Structure 1
Amino acid sequence: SLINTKIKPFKNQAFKNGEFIEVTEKDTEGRWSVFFFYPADFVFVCPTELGDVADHYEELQKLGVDVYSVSTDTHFTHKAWHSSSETIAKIKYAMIGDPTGALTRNFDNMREDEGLADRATFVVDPQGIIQAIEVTAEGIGRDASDLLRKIKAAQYVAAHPG
């Protein structure tokens, strides 16, 4: 896996609380980042995983972690979904659009026969090193609280080596 490797450079468009912005690897430097990948916008399962992360976001602006959700849809589509789904509307973190699939492939997380990303979460430290990885098949949800545990543990070790 990509555990303990450095994230690669990227430049993508995103939707965040009503505005369109640019996100690059430079925006992660000096912060803790969570890259939350999912298959697609607008499907019919309510996105509890995205919503669950939203519930913990305040607590996530925190201990110092930025959250970037990612799918191969465009930022345009994320904006639409943010206005259509009451669950998605709760999202205050950046929703990255990855139509070329470069971000997804950077994290080796593309389902090539579908053009969609797999359900994978990555925790990246201020130096751009992936410290935790979680991937699940459709139907097996990711628990945000548990994500938080890992992140706290990740932070301790980093300030208390060993």
Structure 2
Amino acid sequence: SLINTKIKPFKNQAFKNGEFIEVTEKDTEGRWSVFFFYPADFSFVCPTELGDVADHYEELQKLGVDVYSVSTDTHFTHKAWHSSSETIAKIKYAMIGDPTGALTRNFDNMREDEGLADRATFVVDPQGIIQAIEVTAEGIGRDASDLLRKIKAAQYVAAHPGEVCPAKWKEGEATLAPSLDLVGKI
């Protein structure tokens, strides 16, 4: 997988809150980012997943986390979808269009026989490093509560070097402090 690699440069158009904008890797520097890939606008599982993320978007911004949804549809199409679907209408984050497939291929996430991105989510830290990856099959929707838990764990590890977040970790739970003495003790 791409875990612990740096994201690649990119330049894409996007729809965001009634405007077209250009997003590049420069916009992700010094920020936590979620790249949220999905296969197709006007599809079935895709809107429900996007809406799930939109519900959590206030909480994400409070954590200093930006969201970029990505499909290989155009930004024109995202705009159209945003106004015709009640679910998509509530999205306030950037919807990136990736018709060249370049951004999707940067994340090695193309279904080459379809020209559509797989259901993959990448959590990316302020230095561009991928810290968490989730990929599901066409028929299996993701769950934003799991994303948030991973983001919080990722942020904690970043802010507390010498500590690691064990399984199931939530804020307030105990952490492990790697050391020679701890080796084989757990």
1:6-35 C-alpha deviation (Å, 9 max, x unpaired): 000000000001000000000000000000
Computing the radius of gyration from Cα coordinates, the structure with the larger value is 2
Q: CA deviation at 1:145?
A: 1.1
Q: Helix, strand or coil: the match of 1:47?
A: helix
Note the residue ranges of structure 2 that are not aligned, 5 or more in a row.
Answer: 163-186
CA change 1:46–1:23 in 2 (3 A) is closer
Query: Partners in 2 of 1:15 and 1:22 — Cα distance?
Result: 9
Aligned length: 162
Query: Partners in 2 of 1:46 and 1:70 — Cα distance?
Result: 11
Name the residue aligned to 1:20: 20
Preserved contact between residue 69 and residue 94 of structure 1 (Cα < 8 Å): yes
Query: Partners in 1 of 2:140 and 2:44 — Cα distance?
Result: 16
1:115-138 C-alpha deviation (Å, 9 max, x unpaired): 000000000000000000000001
Q: CA deviation at 1:141?
A: 1.2
1:50-96 C-alpha deviation (Å, 9 max, x unpaired): 00000000111111000000000000000000000000001000000
CA change 1:75–1:129 in 2 (3 A) is same
Query: Partners in 1 of 2:69 and 2:122 — Cα distance?
Result: 10
Preserved contact between residue 39 and residue 46 of structure 2 (Cα < 8 Å): no
Preserved contact between residue 32 and residue 65 of structure 1 (Cα < 8 Å): yes
Q: CA deviation at 1:43?
A: 1.9
Q: CA deviation at 1:45?
A: 4.6
Q: Which portions of structure 1, spanning 4 or more consecutive aligned residues, are displaced by more than 3 angstroms? A: none
Query: Partners in 1 of 2:38 and 2:45 — Cα distance?
Result: 12
Q: Helix, strand or coil: the match of 1:52?
A: helix
Preserved contact between residue 34 and residue 123 of structure 2 (Cα < 8 Å): yes
Note the residue ranges of structure 1 that are not aligned, 5 or more in a row.
Answer: none
Query: Partners in 1 of 2:115 and 2:45 — Cα distance?
Result: 19
Query: Partners in 1 of 2:14 and 2:108 — Cα distance?
Result: 20
TM-score by length of 1: 0.98
Q: CA deviation at 1:161?
A: 1.0
Q: CA deviation at 1:146?
A: 1.0
Preserved contact between residue 46 and residue 87 of structure 1 (Cα < 8 Å): no
Preserved contact between residue 51 and residue 87 of structure 2 (Cα < 8 Å): yes
Name the residue aligned to 2:49: 49
Work out which structure has the larger RCO, using CA pairs closer than 8 Å and 6 or more positions apart in sequence.
Answer: 1
Preserved contact between residue 35 and residue 70 of structure 2 (Cα < 8 Å): yes
Q: Helix, strand or coil: the match of 1:73?
A: coil
CA change 1:110–1:46 in 2 (3 A) is closer
Query: Partners in 2 of 1:30 and 1:39 — Cα distance?
Result: 28
